[PDB]
Amino acid sequence: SEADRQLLEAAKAGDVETVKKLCTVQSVNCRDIEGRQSTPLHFAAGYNRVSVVEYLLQHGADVHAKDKGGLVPLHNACSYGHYEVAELLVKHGAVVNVADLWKFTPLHEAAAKGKYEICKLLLQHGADPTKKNRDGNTPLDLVKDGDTDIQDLLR
């Protein structure tokens, strides 16, 4: 519907005032049907819209909602290096060892994308560096050659 479509666009743009205007109990966890079924929190998280992320969480956004590929907003935060966002989600109860349809964890995302401090954050909250995805790869397996500091951290 149009209202949900606009909410999603606002959460993506970081347009707080429009979020405040369209976020109802009915719509706060709506899903983008045309894409990979992201929720407003997925978008706010993936696009590093901290205020929107805070607002949505405070107004009942589901920190554990999986999209079409089985991603939770923490995946989005971790893959794109949004540290504060990652911290917000974790502090609000996000499961760190959560796994998508391919058994990728946020730690797989953060490791493959070369985000050290995010990897560290995940490890401090008990992320398992030994978890394998569908390809039989640990997050360590996914680390670029240059990122020896991340290899060391995961090891």
């Binding site: 983008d32 696009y47 590093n48 999209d67 590929g69 893959s79 290096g81 949004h82 990728f104």
Partner: peptide
Amino acid sequence: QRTQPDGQSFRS
């Protein structure tokens, strides 16, 4: 096949 999360690394 597996595609990227909604989002991007850089706000600019």
